[PDB]
Amino acid sequence: SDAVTIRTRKVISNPLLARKQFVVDVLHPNRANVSKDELREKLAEVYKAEKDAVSVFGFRTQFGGGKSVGFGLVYNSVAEAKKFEPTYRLVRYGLAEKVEKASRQQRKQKKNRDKKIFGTGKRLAKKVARRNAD
Amino acid sequence: HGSLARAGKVKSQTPKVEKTEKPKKPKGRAYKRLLYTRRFVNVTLVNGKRRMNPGPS
Amino acid sequence: GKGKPRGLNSARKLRVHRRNNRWAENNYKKRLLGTAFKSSPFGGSSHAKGIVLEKLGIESKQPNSAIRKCVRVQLIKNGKKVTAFVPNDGCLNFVDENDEVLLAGFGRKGKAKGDIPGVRFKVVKVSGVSLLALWKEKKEKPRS
Amino acid sequence: PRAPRTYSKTYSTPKRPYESSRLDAELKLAGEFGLKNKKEIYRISFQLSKIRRAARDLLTRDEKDPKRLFEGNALIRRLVRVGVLSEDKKKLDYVLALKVEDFLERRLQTQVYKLGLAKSVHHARVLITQRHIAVGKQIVNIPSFMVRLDSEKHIDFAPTSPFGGARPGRVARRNAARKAEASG
RNA sequence: GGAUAGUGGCCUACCAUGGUUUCAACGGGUAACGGGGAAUAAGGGUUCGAUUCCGGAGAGGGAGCCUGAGAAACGGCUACCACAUCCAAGGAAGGCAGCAGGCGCGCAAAUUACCCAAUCCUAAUUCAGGGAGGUAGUGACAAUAAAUAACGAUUGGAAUGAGUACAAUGUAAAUACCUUAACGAGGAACAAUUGGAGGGCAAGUCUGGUGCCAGCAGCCGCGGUAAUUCCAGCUCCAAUAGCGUAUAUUAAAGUUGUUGCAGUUAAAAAGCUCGUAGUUGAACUUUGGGCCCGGUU
Fold first, then answer.
1. Residues of B in contact with C67 (CB under 8 A)
2. SS3 track for chain D
């Protein structure tokens, strides 16, 4: 936006997770809100690092516009981000692919149906087919 | 005297008169302002005492 | 010596004297015996649904003169029959025979109001519809 | 489950609800401060009564008592920081001498009016609640915003508010568009 | 001596006759899980505590038991009782006081939703699982803030949020919130109700209707052809997104009285005396005086 002037406070480094973490406040006067991708690329350019290494989340807009205050996170590589950032954040940024887990109800129904069967069930299927066709 | 029937005689027989249309009254702080400007600068009601709803005399 | 014991070791005597004397209190005895649970028609309840058995005209007490409209309601939850007042003009015509009516207290705790003899309860809802709503035309009685 | 979320009431309705003198005094206050309900005066009087109870229990304590000193200096410090009290009357007895008018006068409504950004107190409340007035540099729409002693100097129109030099609102834009359409 | 993981009448054999009690035992009721605490209170106190935390107990009742360190385990078995389901009539399988949800009971209480993203938990264990938990839906239980309008001239401009909505933030993904393109005030609009106007308890000696009828009324009371009290209109008042009603409880209640009640006549001094428990019970035993030290003013 206009005069974003992205500031990063409390920039304590985190060698344990191989990242630099900071609270990021962006001032966007005369603007609704600045998008996640724009903030990610701006932080990457300002930190001289790859865009996929940086990550930002939990952006709370102050009352009446002007600025939003949130949390920032930049890693030491892209593999570090891929291994430490969670799956939802990775698919949010597009660096990963959303899993196709079935919904909880039908997943649990499948679990119960498989639990009620003992073994691989090949013998059960063969016996059932023989009895039904006979 | 004696009424087991005729219950609601007056409520049924009273001549209906509709609520006449009047300018909408303000609500909230506006109504508080109306009350203040009706009871503290319009103190002309005094006749020895301040009558809040004087009869049309 | 003002009758009551004053000794520094008379705490038991004071406690027991108070225990005996508290029974004379109207509300304390009622709560302790649980007459609300035992004997009161509502069983200590703020309201009670019932089925009206018949309409009644109860003459008002002196110096008043009028025929207050009432209903003989048998409570669904208790089976006790109580007289209930229909407290608004013309609202008696709303209540019919065998209509489910909600009963509430009359304000005076277990007593009667003014010139009504022996009526301690009043109707609030008829077949789930409020008496004042039916009176002021805000609702329409299903009559089903 | 989750630990209970504690809450409290900010006022206390008075006994004998129907005193003519009390009603007249509270309506005087409401009319001359733009208060929407008696609840606002009730809340202000409840805060006053709470701090006065604390002040009386504090004055009951012996002088130079550690608790007395700590709580008294804290109370007067917060009072002067709010601005309800004044710097000259830094003693504790002036907390007792306080009236509800001081708290009602330290509100954002009346402080906007005193600063002069408003035609009336009601105009001040209207401007406050339409996100036009902004303390410091942030929009606030709280009529009862207790202004600090370093905030009245920075009370002014909001940067986003059309009266604060921003885009001229919506009705002005609509009428300007209508005028341009007619003149076209 | 057995039994226990272990002490122990926990059980067993022999022996003595003991143990509790008017300082309230035993028995009965509890609409009684206990507590941290809640409401209301000058001080004392009164009432409540099913319920977010701690400790108990239960899985329809009751007992027995396997496994296991840990169970009298019930989303583990065994039997009976009471329910209740599918049978092809020989058989078989259950315990929602978990989550939703249905019936019943009632005055009384929500969706058969999404997710392991947090807080944690478990397993072989970073990865899986978790109706634990979180999110959303219903939700005037209660709490916080606060729109229903402001100004100008004698009819006009200017502002805005409700309500939509590209977008982004938000989130596990979302809904809403915070922001914001654009749309979105002039009244018949974008319309605030709930109770009340004889007194306590401020607010009508206004009009029409009724005429001890209807009816109102917490209490006193109003109403029988001039209703300040009923039903309507207008006006006004109190509170106000809340207001009223019923029940219970607290203050008021010095009407529970230890603080702090009353007993001649209002309710109350037993007919009188004796007397155990209980409560209370005359004084007297080391004082006064000198010399210093060290604290605060």
1. 1-4
2. CCCCCCCCCCCCCCCCCCCHHHHHHHHHHHHHHCCCCHHHHHHHHHHHHHHHHHHHHHHHCCCCCHHHHHHHHHHHHHHHHHCCCCCCCCCCHHHHHCCHHHHHHCCHHHHHHHHCCCCCHHHHHHHHHCCCEEECCEECCCCCCCCCCCCHHHCEECCCCHHHCCCCCCHHHHHHHHHHHHHC
